Structure 1
Amino acid sequence: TKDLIVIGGGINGAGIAADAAGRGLSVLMLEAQDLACATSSASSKLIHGGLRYLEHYEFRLVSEALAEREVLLKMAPHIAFPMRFRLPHRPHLRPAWMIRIGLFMYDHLGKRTSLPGSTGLRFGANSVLKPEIKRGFEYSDCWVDDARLVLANAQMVVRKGGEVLTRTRATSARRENGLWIVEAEDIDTGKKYSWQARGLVNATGPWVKQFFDDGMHLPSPYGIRLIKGSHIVVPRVHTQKQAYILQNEDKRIVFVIPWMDEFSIIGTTDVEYKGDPKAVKIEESEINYLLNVYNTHFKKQLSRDDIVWTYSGVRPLCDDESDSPQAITRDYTLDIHDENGKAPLLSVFGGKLTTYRKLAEHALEKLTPYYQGIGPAWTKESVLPGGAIEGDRDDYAARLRRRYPFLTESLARHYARTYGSNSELLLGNAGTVSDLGEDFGHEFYEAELKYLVDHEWVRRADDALWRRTKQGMWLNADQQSRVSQWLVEYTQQRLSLAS
Structure 2
Amino acid sequence: METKDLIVIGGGINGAGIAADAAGRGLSVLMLEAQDLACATSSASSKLIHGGLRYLEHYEFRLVSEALAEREVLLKMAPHIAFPMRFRLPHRPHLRPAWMIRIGLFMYDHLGKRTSLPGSTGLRFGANSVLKPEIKRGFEYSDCWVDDARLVLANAQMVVRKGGEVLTRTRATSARRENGLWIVEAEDIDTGKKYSWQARGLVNATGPWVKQFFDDGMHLPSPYGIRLIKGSHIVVPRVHTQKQAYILQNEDKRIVFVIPWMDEFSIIGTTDVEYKGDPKAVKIEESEINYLLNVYNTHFKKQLSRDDIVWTYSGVRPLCDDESDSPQAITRDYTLDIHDENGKAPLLSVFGGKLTTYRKLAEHALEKLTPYYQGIGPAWTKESVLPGGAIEGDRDDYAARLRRRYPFLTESLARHYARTYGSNSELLLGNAGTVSDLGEDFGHEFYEAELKYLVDHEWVRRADDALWRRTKQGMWLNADQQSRVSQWLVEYTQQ
TM-score range, shorter chain: over 0.9
CA distance in 1 between partners of 2:224 and 2:176 (Å):
20
CA distance in 2 between partners of 1:91 and 1:410 (Å):
43
Corresponding residue number in structure 2 for 1:171: 173
SS of 1:463's equivalent in the other structure is: helix
CA distance in 1 between partners of 2:313 and 2:443 (Å):
23
**1:396 has 2:368 as partner:** no
Q: 1:50 aligns with which of 23, 43, 52?
A: 52
Q: CA deviation at 1:180?
A: 0.1
Q: CA deviation at 1:101?
A: 1.1
Q: CA deviation at 1:103?
A: 0.4
1:96-149: per-residue Cα shift (whole Å, max 9, x none)?
A: 010111101000011200001111110000000000000000000000000000
CA distance in 2 between partners of 1:231 and 1:139 (Å):
22
SS of 2:220's equivalent in the other structure is: coil
Unaligned runs of 5+ in 2: none
CA distance in 2 between partners of 1:372 and 1:434 (Å):
52
CA distance in 1 between partners of 2:198 and 2:125 (Å):
63
1:148-188: per-residue Cα shift (whole Å, max 9, x none)?
A: 00000000000000000000000000000000000000000
Unaligned runs of 5+ in 1: 494-499
CA distance in 1 between partners of 2:24 and 2:331 (Å):
30
Q: CA deviation at 1:396?
A: 0.7
SS of 2:320's equivalent in the other structure is: coil
SS of 1:429's equivalent in the other structure is: coil
Q: CA deviation at 1:390?
A: 1.7
1:282-327: per-residue Cα shift (whole Å, max 9, x none)?
A: 0000000000000000000000000000000000000000000000
Q: CA deviation at 1:263?
A: 0.1
Percent identity (aligned): 100
Corresponding residue number in structure 2 for 1:90: 92
CA distance in 2 between partners of 1:292 and 1:324 (Å):
21
CA distance in 2 between partners of 1:275 and 1:492 (Å):
35
SS of 1:310's equivalent in the other structure is: strand
Displaced runs of 4+ in structure 1, greater than 6 A?
none
1:343-388: per-residue Cα shift (whole Å, max 9, x none)?
A: 0000000000000000000000000000010000000000000000
Q: CA deviation at 1:391?
A: 1.4
CA distance in 2 between partners of 1:350 and 1:203 (Å):
10
Question: CA RMSD for the aligned pairs?
Answer: 0.3
SS of 1:23's equivalent in the other structure is: coil
CA distance in 2 between partners of 1:492 and 1:259 (Å):
35
CA distance in 1 between partners of 2:201 and 2:292 (Å):
44
CA distance in 2 between partners of 1:162 and 1:458 (Å):
18
Q: CA deviation at 1:215?
A: 0.0
TM-score by length of 2: 0.99
1:414-468: per-residue Cα shift (whole Å, max 9, x none)?
A: 0000000000000000010000000000000000000000000000000000000
* Aligned counterparts, 1:232-251, within 5 A: 232-251=234-253
> Which stretch shifts more, 237-246 or 390-399?
390-399
* Aligned counterparts, 1:140-159, within 5 A: 140-159=142-161
CA distance in 2 between partners of 1:142 and 1:185 (Å):
38
1:52-95: per-residue Cα shift (whole Å, max 9, x none)?
A: 00000000000000000010000000000000000000000000
Q: How many residues align?
A: 493
TM-score by length of 1: 0.99
CA distance in 2 between partners of 1:256 and 1:74 (Å):
25
* Aligned counterparts, 1:423-442, within 5 A: 423-442=425-444
